[PDB]
Every structure is written in C-alpha cells, then in structure tokens.
Design an enzyme around this catalytic site. Structure first.
Site, PDB file in Angstrom:
ATOM      1  N   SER A   1       0.630  -1.186   0.427  1.00 60.01           N
ATOM      2  CA  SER A   1      -0.226  -0.399   0.012  1.00 60.01           C
ATOM      3  C   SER A   1       0.978   0.716  -0.055  1.00 60.01           C
ATOM      4  O   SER A   1       0.345   2.500  -0.190  1.00 60.01           O
ATOM      5  CB  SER A   1      -1.181   0.320   1.093  1.00 60.01           C
ATOM      6  OG  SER A   1      -2.072  -1.170   0.964  1.00 60.01           O
TER       7      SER A   1
ATOM      8  N   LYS B   1       0.861   4.062  -2.977  1.00 64.76           N
ATOM      9  CA  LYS B   1      -0.443   4.538  -3.416  1.00 64.76           C
ATOM     10  C   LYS B   1       0.158   5.912  -2.789  1.00 64.76           C
ATOM     11  O   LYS B   1      -0.502   6.273  -3.830  1.00 64.76           O
ATOM     12  CB  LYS B   1      -1.461   4.604  -1.975  1.00 64.76           C
ATOM     13  CG  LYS B   1      -1.988   2.778  -1.979  1.00 64.76           C
ATOM     14  CD  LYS B   1      -3.315   2.711  -0.948  1.00 64.76           C
ATOM     15  CE  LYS B   1      -3.238   1.208  -1.189  1.00 64.76           C
ATOM     16  NZ  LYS B   1      -4.357   0.705  -0.586  1.00 64.76           N
TER      17      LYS B   1
ATOM     18  N   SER C   1      -5.418   4.010   3.248  1.00 60.20           N
ATOM     19  CA  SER C   1      -5.580   2.574   2.384  1.00 60.20           C
ATOM     20  C   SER C   1      -6.161   1.917   2.343  1.00 60.20           C
ATOM     21  O   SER C   1      -5.957   0.707   1.725  1.00 60.20           O
ATOM     22  CB  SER C   1      -4.774   1.157   3.888  1.00 60.20           C
ATOM     23  OG  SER C   1      -3.078   1.304   3.476  1.00 60.20           O
TER      24      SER C   1
ATOM     25  N   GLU D   1      -5.396  -3.768  -6.914  1.00 66.12           N
ATOM     26  CA  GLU D   1      -5.036  -4.508  -5.583  1.00 66.12           C
ATOM     27  C   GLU D   1      -6.709  -5.588  -5.408  1.00 66.12           C
ATOM     28  O   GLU D   1      -6.928  -5.465  -6.533  1.00 66.12           O
ATOM     29  CB  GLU D   1      -5.575  -3.227  -4.733  1.00 66.12           C
ATOM     30  CG  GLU D   1      -4.999  -2.450  -4.243  1.00 66.12           C
ATOM     31  CD  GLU D   1      -4.405  -3.014  -3.209  1.00 66.12           C
ATOM     32  OE1 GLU D   1      -4.110  -4.272  -2.870  1.00 66.12           O
ATOM     33  OE2 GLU D   1      -3.307  -2.322  -2.413  1.00 66.12           O
TER      34      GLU D   1
ATOM     35  N   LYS E   1       3.165   6.728   5.353  1.00 67.59           N
ATOM     36  CA  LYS E   1       2.057   5.160   4.649  1.00 67.59           C
ATOM     37  C   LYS E   1       2.884   3.996   5.424  1.00 67.59           C
ATOM     38  O   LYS E   1       3.893   3.657   5.114  1.00 67.59           O
ATOM     39  CB  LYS E   1       1.981   6.390   3.322  1.00 67.59           C
ATOM     40  CG  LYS E   1       0.991   4.990   2.392  1.00 67.59           C
ATOM     41  CD  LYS E   1      -0.297   5.761   3.219  1.00 67.59           C
ATOM     42  CE  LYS E   1      -1.310   4.222   2.384  1.00 67.59           C
ATOM     43  NZ  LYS E   1      -1.387   3.230   3.545  1.00 67.59           N
TER      44      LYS E   1
ATOM     45  N   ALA F   1       0.951  -3.481   4.416  1.00 68.59           N
ATOM     46  CA  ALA F   1       0.980  -4.618   4.701  1.00 68.59           C
ATOM     47  C   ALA F   1       0.837  -5.613   3.473  1.00 68.59           C
ATOM     48  O   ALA F   1       0.080  -5.623   2.747  1.00 68.59           O
ATOM     49  CB  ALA F   1       0.038  -5.357   5.709  1.00 68.59           C
TER      50      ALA F   1
END
Ligand SMILES: [Ca+2]
Length: 263
Positions: A45, A48, A105, A141, A209, A212
C-alpha cells in the site's frame, strides 16, 4: 547511527526473512544509514503515495481535477474499502479518493485512481519519467500485496522509494500547492498506529504511509522530524517472515524508537 543499524539487523534475526532500511536527509538527500538499500521488496500500500503523486501531477498539468466526480459499481469494491464502500451512490472526487487511499489505505479508491491514469504500467511510466527506473507496479489491489518470493512485480528498493518520495515532497516535479496536499494526506494518516507513530514523541512531525502484505510482508515510508517539521525520510520494508503482524509491528516501532533516540 550505528545503534539503529544494529537494531535493524537484530530485527531481521528476530523476525526471520529480510528487512530493508534507509534514512535520508530531507534537504540534502544524503543517505544517513542503510540496510539492503538496493534489494527489492514488495511495495504494498506504500505505492498509494506514488499513485496520488502521479495524479496530482496531472492536476498540475490541468489534465486532472481533484473535484472531478467518479462513479463506480459494487463490483469495483475489493477487499478493504472503509470509505469507498460508503459512497456507492454518491460517487467520490479524485481528491476524496486520494484522501481515502492515503489516510485509510482504501484499496478500491486506489483502483479507481489507477484507472484515471491508465493503470500500473502508466504509474511506472510516471516513475520512469521522473528518474526512478527501479520502482514498478504491475497489478491492482489486492493481488499486488501477494509478495511471492523472488517476484519483482510490484516491488521497489529502499533507496529507490526513499529518493522518489523526496523528489515528490520537495523537488520541482509538483507545484507547491500539490506538494503541500500530498504531505497533508500523509500527515492525516489514520491507519499506521503501531508503527513509527507509536514511538514518536509529542512535538514531532510525521507524514507517512504504511503497508501490509502476504507472507509476512510489512512496510512503511515516512517523512518525520522534531520541532513540528520534517527533516528526514525513513523507509522500512520486510517480507518472507512467519512472525505475526504484531512482532512485525513491534519491530518497526522499535526501529523507530531507535532512530529517534540517536537522532
Ligand atoms: Ca541477517
């Protein structure tokens, strides 16, 4: 500081697998400490922040509009979408979508933003365009947090990420307005409690940020400093471990406590 490096190396033996670390001066860009700086780790993540970087960039060029209203269906919603799952009938703006992606996230938001630019390869072409020929996003994702061993898809290296973030936060790539916006989102990060933040003292500034993944993947990119202003960029990554997400969280918070102690 040698002590923090000792604690990173200790973190690796404790968790098993690999741990990547780099500490960069915000102004100079000088590498202060490092560990596995040029090795590849699944971004997760953390990417992003790079996505919204690409997005803001198009806004700056008058190609995109933060207020533009995007609409989606229930089939767009993938796993983990706190915000986007609320605004199915509303729709959301590019801005609010970026706010969701960084501060929560939100995975779906990230997918929607990716579409506005043409997807993974387009984000990579943005990275390539700005001097980062190492970072690479390949999937959407949530497949991108898969982190299969020896898979260079959706990966980066500590030094690559660290210097890219620096360019995005301080360079001449993004206007002042957009550089401020991006760091405002990262300061408004609300899903990174048990990491660097849990070791950060009152008075200190942090724009970050987290990420996981699977196979014990975990990561975080941060801009932090004392006296309420950022002055260093810290990037941490780990994968291949079997330890729980706590033993991983705890090892990150400890690495943090150490970089602060020997500032
Ligand atoms: Ca080791």
């Amino acid at each position: 500081h040698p002590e923090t490096l000792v604690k990173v190396k200790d973190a690796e033996d404790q968790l098993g697998g690999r741990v990547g670390y780099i500490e960069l001066d915000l102004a100079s860009g000088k590498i202060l400490e490092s560990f596995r700086p040029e090795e590849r780790f699944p971004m997760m993540s953390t990417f992003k922040v790079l996505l919204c970087g690409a997005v803001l960039s198009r806004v700056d060029a008058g190609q995109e509009q933060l207020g533009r209203r995007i609409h989606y269906s229930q089939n767009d919603l993938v796993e983990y979408s706190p915000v986007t799952e609320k605004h199915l009938t509303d729709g959301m703006t590019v801005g609010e979508l970026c706010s969701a992606a960084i501060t929560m996230s939100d995975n779906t938001a990230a997918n929607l933003l990716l579409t506005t630019i043409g997807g993974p390869k387009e984000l990579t072409a943005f990275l390539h365009n700005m001097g980062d020929h190492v970072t690479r996003l390949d999937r959407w994702e949530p497949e991108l947090n898969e982190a299969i061993p020896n898979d260079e898809r959706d990966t980066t290296t500590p030094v690559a990420m660290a210097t890219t973030l620096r360019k995005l936060l301080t360079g001449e790539l993004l206007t002042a307005a957009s550089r401020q916006q991006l760091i405002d989102w990262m300061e408004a990060d609300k899903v990174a409690g048990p990491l660097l933040r849990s070791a950060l003292p009152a008075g200190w500034f942090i724009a970050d940020k987290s990420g996981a993944g699977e196979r014990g993947s975990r990561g975080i990119i941060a801009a932090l400093g004392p006296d309420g202003k950022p002055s260093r960029i810290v990037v941490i990554y780990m994968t291949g471990s079997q330890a729980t997400m706590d033993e991983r969280n705890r090892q990150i918070a400890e690495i943090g406590a150490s970089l602060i102690k020997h500032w």
